[PDB]
Structures are given as structure tokens and as C-alpha cells.
Amino acid sequence: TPAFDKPKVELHVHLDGAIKPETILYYGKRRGIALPADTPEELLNIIGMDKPLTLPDFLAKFDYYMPAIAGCRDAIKRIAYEFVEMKAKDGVVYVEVRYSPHLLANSKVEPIPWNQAEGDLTPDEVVSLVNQGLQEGERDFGVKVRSILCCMRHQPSWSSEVVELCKKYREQTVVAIDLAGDETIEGSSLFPGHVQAYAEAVKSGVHRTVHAGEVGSANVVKEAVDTLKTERLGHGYHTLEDTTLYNRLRQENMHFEICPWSSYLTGAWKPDTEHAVIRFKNDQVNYSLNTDDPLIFKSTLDTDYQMTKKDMGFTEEEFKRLNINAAKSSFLPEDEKKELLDLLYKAYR
Ligand SMILES: OC[C@H]1O[C@@H](n2c[nH+]c3c2N=CN[C@H]3O)[C@H](O)[C@@H]1O
Numbered sequence: 001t002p003a004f005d006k007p008k009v010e011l012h013v014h015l016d017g018a019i020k021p022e023t024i025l026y027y028g029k030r031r032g033i034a035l036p037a038d039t040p041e042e043l044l045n046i047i048g049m050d051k052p053l054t055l056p057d058f059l060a061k062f063d064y065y066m067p068a069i070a071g072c073r074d075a076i077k078r079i080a081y082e083f084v085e086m087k088a089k090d091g092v093v094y095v096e097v098r099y100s101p102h103l104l105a106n107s108k109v110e111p112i113p114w115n116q117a118e119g120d121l122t123p124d125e126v127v128s129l130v131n132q133g134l135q136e137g138e139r140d141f142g143v144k145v146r147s148i149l150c151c152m153r154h155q156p157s158w159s160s161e162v163v164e165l166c167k168k169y170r171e172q173t174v175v176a177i178d179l180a181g182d183e184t185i186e187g188s189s190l191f192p193g194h195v196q197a198y199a200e201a202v203k204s205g206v207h208r209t210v211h212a213g214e215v216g217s218a219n220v221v222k223e224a225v226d227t228l229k230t231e232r233l234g235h236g237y238h239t240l241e242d243t244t245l246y247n248r249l250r251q252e253n254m255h256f257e258i259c260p261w262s263s264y265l266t267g268a269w270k271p272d273t274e275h276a277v278i279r280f281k282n283d284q285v286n287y288s289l290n291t292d293d294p295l296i297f298k299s300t301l302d303t304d305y306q307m308t309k310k311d312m313g314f315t316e317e318e319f320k321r322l323n324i325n326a327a328k329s330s331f332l333p334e335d336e337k338k339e340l341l342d343l344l345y346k347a348y349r
């Protein structure tokens with residue numbers, strides 16, 4: 001069933017884990033990269049999940065397939081292409097994708113990932129691939145893509161870099177810096193490299209967001225809002241613990257990015273206790289429903305929206321209004337945003 005059928009907005013997703021089993025498959029068996037499987041479903045059935053695991057675990061599923069794709073120059077622009085694809089197939093007019101240059105290489109990179117080998121490929125290029133691949137994909141699917149570049153919790157050394165990336169790819173196609181990776185690393189969201197790079201962001205314009213919340217304490221969010229300056233909270237579930245912090249973001253007017261089906265699956269949730277998502281709906285705080293990782297969880301944007309009208313009862317009347325908010329919170333000029341607001345507005349309504 002539809003389950004929401006008007007033209008959606010989406011803010012939280014990762015390139016990384018918006019690949020199809022096939023493009024993996026190709027490259028494993030093409031530049032040779034001994035892969036973990038064969039039948040395109042078996043690939044899926046190692047890569048993805050169904051019993052709720054733990055955030056740490058989630059995060060090394062990734063080590064299964066990435067080698068495949070990592071630099072090869074080729075693949076960057078192709079999996080950027082096929083990703084815009086999926087985003088016009090399930091219902092979306094507007095997406096922000098995130099990703100991590102650092103995972104996507106090759107050269108420089110003194111902790112060299114997966115682990116793999118030297119090296120044409122740079123941060124400076126593994127972006128300018130994607131911008132074409134989301135510019136193309138845009139061109140050919142009806143959907144406008146802007147990307148988000150992700151600092152990455154466990155490596156502060158690299159965070160510095162991403163701000164220079166964002167600044168200078170700024171609009172061709174990047175509208176933002178993020179923080180991503182294991183919440184459990186005690187202290188991570190404060191380490192010097194991160195705050196330094198966020199604050200070259202606020203010192204220099206760059207829009208900010210942080211996965212804070214999810215599977216770690218309310219503190220990690222309090223850090224994120226106040227020390228890092230996060231313009232919107234990447235998940236923000238555990239902010240319902242410090243219930244005076246909670247009234248302070250409801251009050252600041254600020255985006256929670258929920259990821260339903262993701263929540264059960266990483267660990268951020270016990271299925272015995274009402275998910276933060278229905279709460280935000282009761283309180284009417286600006287949230288956005290969302291996908292996070294299509295591949296690793298075996299899903300589609302319909303999966304969230306349907307976990308949400310049938311388990312946790314959701315009017316269409318809500319869906320309407322969250323998809324207006326997400327648009328309101330987008331990292332896109334008031335320019336581009338009056339007119340993506342004119343879209344869903346004269347179509348919901
Ligand atoms: O895409 C940047 C990184 O996002 C991480 N990722 C993706 N979704 C999530 C996540 N880490 C935690 N939160 C979840 O929302 C993976 O480490 C990936 O390398």
C-alpha cells in the first residue's frame with residue numbers, strides 16, 4: 001500500500017549504504033576484489049541485517065563490501081549515479097546525501113582503509129566524482145541532489161579536511177558538514193579535531209549537523225548542540241532523557257532526523273518502549289522520516305513510512321506536515337527553498 005504517495009523530502013542517507021548488490025558484485029569481480037559472496041541475494045544476505053544488532057556491529061558490516069568500491073575511480077561516479085536513481089524511484093523530489101571521502105580511497109589518507117592500497121585517489125577527486133554523479137543523476141531523474149560531507153568520529157585527523165572540502169565544493173553540490181560513526185567511542189564528539197573543524201564551519205558559513213543521540217546518552221546531544229553548534233540533530237533519540245534539554249530543543253525549533261526502521265535495527269530502540277518518533281509527533285517537534293542505510297537494512301523509504309503507519313499509527317495528515325518541515329529544515333537557500341516549498345505545498349494541500 002502507498003503508504004505515502006505525494007512528493008517526499010529526505011535528509012538522512014548514506015551513499016556508503018545506498019549501493020545495490022549488483023554494483024558491489026560487478027566491481028568485486030571486475031578489478032578483482034575478492035568479495036564475500038556471489039548470488040546477488042547472498043550478497044544481500046551477508047551485507048544486510050535482520051535481527052537488531054548493535055551500533056558497533058552495524059558499522060563493520062561495511063567492511064564486508066566497501067573494498068569492492070573503494071577507488072576504483074569508476075565506481076565513485078557510477079554509485080553516485082545509481083543512487084540518485086533510487087531516490088526518484090521511491091518518492092523523492094529533494095535529497096541530501098551524506099558520505100565520507102575518507103572511506104573512498106586510496107591515496108593520502110594515512111590510515112588507508114579496509115584495508116587497501118596506494119593510490120591514485122584523493123579526497124579532492126572522490127568528491128568531484130560524486131558531484132557529477134549527483135549532477136548527472138539529477139539531470140536524468142527529476143530529483144535535486146545536494147550532498148553532505150561527513151567527518152568521521154574515529155578519525156579526527158581527517159575532519160579538518162572535510163571543512164575545506166565543503167567550503168569549496170559549496171553548492172556544486174555540498175551544503176554541509178556532518179559527524180558520523182560509533183557513538184560509543186567515549187569522548188568522540190568532543191575531540192580536538194572535530195570541534196576545530198566544526199568551528200571552521202561556523203567561522204565560515206558551512207551548515208552543520210551531527211549524528212547525536214541514536215545509541216548514546218543525552219549528553220552527546222548536549223555536547224553537539226552547545227559545543228559543536230549543530231544546526232540540526234542527526235537522530236536525537238536519547239534527547240528525551242534530559243527532559244529540560246528536551247524542552248529546550250522543542251523550544252529552539254530544530255530538526256530531529258528520525259530513522260524508523262533504522263532505529264529498531266542498530267540498537268537505538270527497545271521494541272518494548274514507544275519509539276521516539278511517535279513522541280515527536282505528539283509534541284509536534286520538527287522531525288523527518290528517513291532512510292539512513294537502504295542496503296545494510298534491506299529497505300526502502302516505503303519501509304519506514306510503513307513501519308510507521310501500521311505499527312505506530314500515523315495519519316496521512318501528519319506525513320503531510322512532516323514533509324513540509326523537512327523541506328523547511330533543508331540545507332538550501334531561501335531561493336531554492338521558497339520554490340521547493342511551492343512544490344509540495346501546491347500538492348498536499
Ligand atoms: O556515510 C558515513 C558513515 O556513516 C556511518 N553510518 C551510517 N548511518 C549511520 C552511521 N553511523 C551511525 N548512525 C547511523 O545513522 C557509516 O560509518 C558510514 O561510513
Ligand SMILES: [Zn+2]
Nearest residue numbers: 012014211292
Ligand atoms: Zn546515519
